[PDB]
Amino acid sequence: KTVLEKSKAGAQSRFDSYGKLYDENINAGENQAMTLRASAAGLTTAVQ
Amino acid sequence: KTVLEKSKAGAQSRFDSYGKLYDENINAGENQAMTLRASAAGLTTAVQASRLAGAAADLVPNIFGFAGGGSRWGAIAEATGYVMEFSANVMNTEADKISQSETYRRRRQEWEIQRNNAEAELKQIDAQLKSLAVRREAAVLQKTS
Amino acid sequence: ASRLAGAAADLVPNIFGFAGGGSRWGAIAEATGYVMEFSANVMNTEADKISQSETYRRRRQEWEIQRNNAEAELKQIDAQLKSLAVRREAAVLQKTS
Amino acid sequence: ELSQFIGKASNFGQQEYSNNQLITPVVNSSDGTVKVYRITREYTTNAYQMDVELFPFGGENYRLDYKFKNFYNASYLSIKLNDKRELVRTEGAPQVNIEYSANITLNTADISQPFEIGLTRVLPSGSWAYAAAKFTVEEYNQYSFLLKLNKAIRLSRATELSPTILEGIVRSVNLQLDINTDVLGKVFLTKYYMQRYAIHAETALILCNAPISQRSYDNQPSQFDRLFNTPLLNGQYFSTGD
Amino acid sequence: IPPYNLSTHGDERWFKLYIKHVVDNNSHIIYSGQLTDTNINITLFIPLDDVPLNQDYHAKVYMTFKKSPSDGTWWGPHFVRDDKGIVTINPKSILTHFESVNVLNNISSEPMDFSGANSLYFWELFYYTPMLVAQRLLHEQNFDEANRWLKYVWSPSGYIVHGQIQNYQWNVRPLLEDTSWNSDPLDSVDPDAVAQHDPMHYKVSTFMRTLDLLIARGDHAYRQLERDTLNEAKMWYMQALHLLGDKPYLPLSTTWSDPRLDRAADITTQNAHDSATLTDLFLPQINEVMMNYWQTLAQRVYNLRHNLSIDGQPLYLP
Amino acid sequence: ANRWLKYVWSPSGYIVHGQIQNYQWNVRPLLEDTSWNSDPLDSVDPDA
Amino acid sequence: QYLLIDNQVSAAIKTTRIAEAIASIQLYVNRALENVEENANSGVISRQFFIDWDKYNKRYSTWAGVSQLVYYPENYIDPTMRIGQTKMMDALLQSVSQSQLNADTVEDAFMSYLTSFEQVANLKVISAYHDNINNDQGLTYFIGLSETDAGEYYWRSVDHSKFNDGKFAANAWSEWHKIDCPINPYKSTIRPVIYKSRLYLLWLEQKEITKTETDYRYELKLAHIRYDGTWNTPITFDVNKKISELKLEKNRAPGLYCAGYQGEDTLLVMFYNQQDTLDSYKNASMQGLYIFADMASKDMTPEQSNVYRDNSYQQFDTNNVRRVNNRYAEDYEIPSSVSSRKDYGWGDYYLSMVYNGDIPTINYKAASSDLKIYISP
Amino acid sequence: QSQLNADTVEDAFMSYLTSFEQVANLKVISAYHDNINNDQGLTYFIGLSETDAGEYYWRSVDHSKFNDGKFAANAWSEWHKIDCPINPYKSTIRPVI
Amino acid sequence: QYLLIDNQVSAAIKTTRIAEAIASIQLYVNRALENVEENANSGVISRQF
Amino acid sequence: KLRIIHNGYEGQKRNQCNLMNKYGKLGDKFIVYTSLGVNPNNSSNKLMFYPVYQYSGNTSGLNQGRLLFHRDTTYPSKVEAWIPGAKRSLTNQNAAIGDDYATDSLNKPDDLKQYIFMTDSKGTATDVSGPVEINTAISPAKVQIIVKAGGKEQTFTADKDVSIQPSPSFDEMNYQFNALEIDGSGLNFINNSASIDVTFTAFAEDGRKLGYESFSIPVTLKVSTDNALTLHHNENGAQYMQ
Amino acid sequence: ANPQLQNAVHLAILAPNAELIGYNNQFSGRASQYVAPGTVSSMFSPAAYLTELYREARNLHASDSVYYLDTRRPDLKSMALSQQNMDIELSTLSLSNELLLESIKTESKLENYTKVMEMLSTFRP
């Protein structure tokens, strides 16, 4: 039983860990990077 | 028991290995690369000031005599244009810094997961060694019988 | 060096006769600007190099883990073969019985 | 291992007892002769209350040094030899963790026999704090000392036994500190019993018709304390007596 | 400057040198330090004016000390430069305070100054540069190059120039001579600054890097575990030990004796300390890092002697 | 992070030239309750 | 909280007597410092020990760290990177960052470093400025130049307070820093100055003009450093007339006097027809202007000119002597007002305080040996 | 970025501080109020950077936010950059709506 | 260190006679080169080998 | 500039020169012990004494002479310097760390020329031998520069060539010579090169070499018939150097 | 003064010499006494840390204040900086009880802790 219990705990750690990452979606840092790429594109009319 | 002990060692190696990676967050070289990305972005203000100085200088005529002038009337617009283009490249530089950093973050997170996976394996293995030891005792009792 | 050399050269006047002069007043600023742009690009190249180098290092670290997994597997399998051999001997004794 | 045999010492001309054993080369007045002194301390009661040690300053002359582990509002302190001779008298309560000392003179007879230094902190009311320790003082011609030490070291290495238990075996065999064949017989039994029963060396010593040790050592309590002075019965310390 | 003599100098070993009658007729400090028991060979560049303020001499130099703190008529050297640029000391000078003064009339130059305006850059060129390069090589396990590089700073076997063995181990002038690179590191938290004030620390750092390299080479060979790489590892560990010299040993009993806290904390002790219970002060601790190297080597040596892997595992079946 | 919060606020206050000052908020307008708005109900904005 | 010991904690949890005493005190201290427990001794709290409470003193491990640093800095020194390393070192490190590091790579990286080293080692000092009244206090800024056509200017400074026993400490000196301004000083005519505690560069430039005949125009360029270390652009002043007033030989540059001045919160700039004898400037008419923080400017009148001259001429370059300017000042430099208190405290029973008073004005007279200070608090 | 340290923060700070100054010192050059009366509407202002080839910026103030003698914090908008090649004689420029 | 052979080694450790001799000499040389063993000969050390 | 210094060789010699530099004068005569080690039965360590005997006179009149010595231990002691054939011993009671000396009770330096046993009585036991007697005086007549040029040999000497002699100093002396004329003609130029070798060397009054230093001055000889190399470009497109 | 550097040989790090002697004359031989990490007697031991904390902490409140360190915890100053106090681990709770129990005994003017427990056993409020 103890062996199975440790297995449960292992799976639980993974479940919650992947849960977290999934729930996070895009990291705030990742959001800033997207913003910058978009911002650069936005200069097209100014440059022209 | 011998088989299980070898498994244990395997899991132990994995655990310690992911441990080490987890703890050694960023390789010093990795930090230098991020430093450089930041440093390059940091040139934005220096660049703008020079281009501006340039444009003003060129509005000044340089030909004198019985004919003259030659000022570059479009100088401001050109300098302005370069700064905007530079800025676009900077935005990528900054985004690249960020992307690299977040990439490392995700990497470390995965190491933590795998570290924990190895840990769970070790604990199950110890539990298996314990159950085996019990089985062994039972076998001894069977021999006794 | 080339951009600075350029600036020096272009501060030299280029018009001679009744009307003269013709130097580029902004020549220094321009050279300075080109150098800064190059520098930014250099930093990115150097950073890319570094990332690439470290990327390979990490790859190798992962390989070592996978190597060692395989090693452990070999040890467990050899241990299992020994376990089986014992089981086999017991079976031989059972046949004998 | 060295400390186990000879205590602690430094090149500063400083010596300190360890494992309740004090050892020192006292040079006689205007005499190159080295009288090696060995003083062994054991507790008779309430060891937890105070640190007490005695140094072989010179012929019959000893420096008595002590430090209290707690505090009583004593009117005065009185230290006696074998409960009859007052060795030290001072007024006021000694303070906790303060070292106090006195120079005392012991009679050759008092020195050669085991003796007890009792310390009583006398209260203004009908009571006092009390603790005490037993001391024995031995003297050796430096050669005699080195020779006994030689035997002790070699025997310990050969047997993997602490000088504590080894002395105990010797004292069990003879009053005097001497290794001989009867000692070796008991050393055999001591080890034999350890192996035969999977028991602690001290247990094996007891089975060799030895007393329960009242001697602490290392950072450990005495055997006596381990049997009777484990969390005390409403704080009452167990001690021997009549 | 002559060796210290309390009876003529005072109880203080303090002294200063001054320059006077150059630019102004006021004196200025040009040197300061303590007297030692040997001669103090102080070489200074003495500036000279285009227009002298004195006919007998173009410059005055003098030294002061506790029992002779002042200036005085004809005290110290009085130098005059002739038309050929030769500087001599005017015989009127009282040279009593000095053991000797010698003008180097054919020297118009001096060795580069590692403590001067450009000191920063010289420290990097001749020290931080090779230390950095070696540390990187060490990290990458490029041991052979790493060794070459540490040797540019220091060699326990010295150096050979044109076939001749030299008289030094430090190849860095400011470590070879103990030259300060700071004035007060206690104004901040910075181990570099600390070492700069006290260069002996750079000497130590260099030593530690050398040990790290030897150990790494040892460990490498040991990890290979082939009979011969094990022999190689043993050798490299012996080298680390040779450099470490004799293992330290500490006293069995301290003068310190489990003092009561009030006492230990008594500012009187602290005041007495800074003025200098001092018996019960806390004792200087050995560098436990260095301790750790001794321990590391002992374990490696043990394992080799016992036919164990670098991890202490048996190199055999039970 | 602590240092950067301290620039805004310190429960222990601040020390200048060796002397403890008389305040915990190091942001003058917060110490003074100065308004940075006139009508926050214009929009759902925690900052306003 | 009062007894600094937990009486709720499970019996199973163990500690040492020393550790307990430590933990107890740390709690005690926090509460006093946090003003949880009132009527604390503020004198004591202000002691450096407690200033550092949040770093190094609160936690033993960090305490030991900073303490150990003193005896064993080598346990903390890592040659890979040092505090205060210069950019050349940064480049060196970066250049060796790849894992495939070998002798060829190393030797090339070294030469890159060395090239930069030489560039620095050979900088020529052109001019310098001491931002103080007297040379014995404060620090001197120096500007120099890389040996290349269309070269680059650099600056560094030295701290005079570190000139102990006649010599500067190594600590007295700062590294050379790059200037990114398009500087083209005419015949080296440039000065580093401090104004409003900021570094500014001023230089004169000559423009070749076709008039046929050839003549020249002169312009004054002003630039300053920004907070991020980059520089602003040059600002141009029309000084051609002021320069035309100096009857210079065709190949001579006007001397440039330039220093900040606290009085009038301004920058004082003057040009002159350089003499061989310093004292000849006592009768020179200085051609100058005022420059303000907003880049405004004013012509300097003859009267003002003579005044600044009389008090500064001793700093002027002569035909064969290159001198360093100081901050302009007269007999005494005195602040015009005081807003910053040095000390204060509570009244009896802390029911009142004298606080945030000020010295809105400081006026003064300064006759020889008679300094009269007028405070209107 | 995930890797931060004290130097990093100070540099970021000084970058902000630099930009702060650039805005803080803008001079006001001219303005236009887009209404008939100055008691209604808003005033548009333009300013200029203290740099060669100086840049123009604009912002405005809402007069309806002028209450009991003073403008609300909300009365004001921030400065905005102008990206045009503007270089008037004697600063002869007006914003208009 | 004096005899250039380790007398504290387990019997389990084996090598050949040529191999041992090499090790002894190599240790000796290092000690001579670093002057662990004082009054070493500067000639010889100075040789290219 | 010929530079002489009594900078002893690292380890033993350095320690001995340190004592010399601190307790004597240039000109003093000393017995320097060249053979040092640790006593097989008396030493518990690898530390040792580094004795030098200073003779009275030779510019330093002494109260019967002194034994100077260096020791490694940081503990105060009674350093005993025993002479077996003389049955004499000096005792530096409460000796300083590092550098100290014992007063010689009798100026009989002959006694020193034998094996000497030194100890701190804490286990440092040094075997002392090799009693070499050295006169540290240096006449300027023994300070020389030797030149080898072609087949010619020239020498120069400080007491002829150096206008001002340096004060006697162990710490450092510099003998600055006037221009020494070397007859360069005769140099054997090979491949248009020859050199002059200049040796800087000196001896102590005992005829004891102080040491030496060698410098050399290369000379390039211009060849008057050496026509410039010519570049040629042949009409057949061939370019070469003549 | 540290033997670890002195034995290095190849570093040429020299001892302070006369200053070692003078220091030891002022500090009872202290610089000759080096210690291993882990001894209480060390400059970096937690006891050293404790000593500094106490020295300063005790001056944070007036001696007659309820918040005076010594008033609230008199044992801190009376406790010694012993090697065993540093090395022995024991229940934190037993330490808490020790403190409160002694305080009660003192306030209640009782002879010992058994008297305290008997007294407490009949307390009603």
Side-chain angles (χ1 to χ4, degrees), chain C residues 73-91:
Chain C
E73 291 170 350
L74 289 167
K75 290 175 180 172
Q76 291 174 60
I77 298 302
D78 193 65
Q80 289 171 328
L81 287 166
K82 289 181 177 66
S83 181
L84 180 61
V86 174
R87 187 183 300 163
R88 189 182 190 277
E89 290 179 356

Side-chain angles (χ1 to χ4, degrees), chain F residues 5-30:
Chain F
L5 292 174
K6 286 177 75 175
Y7 290 124
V8 175
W9 183 87
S10 172
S12 62
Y14 303 88
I15 298 167
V16 61
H17 301 294
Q19 180 172 38
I20 296 164
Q21 298 186 76
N22 62 336
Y23 64 88
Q24 296 179 325
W25 291 103
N26 192 49
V27 180
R28 178 180 175 192
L30 296 180

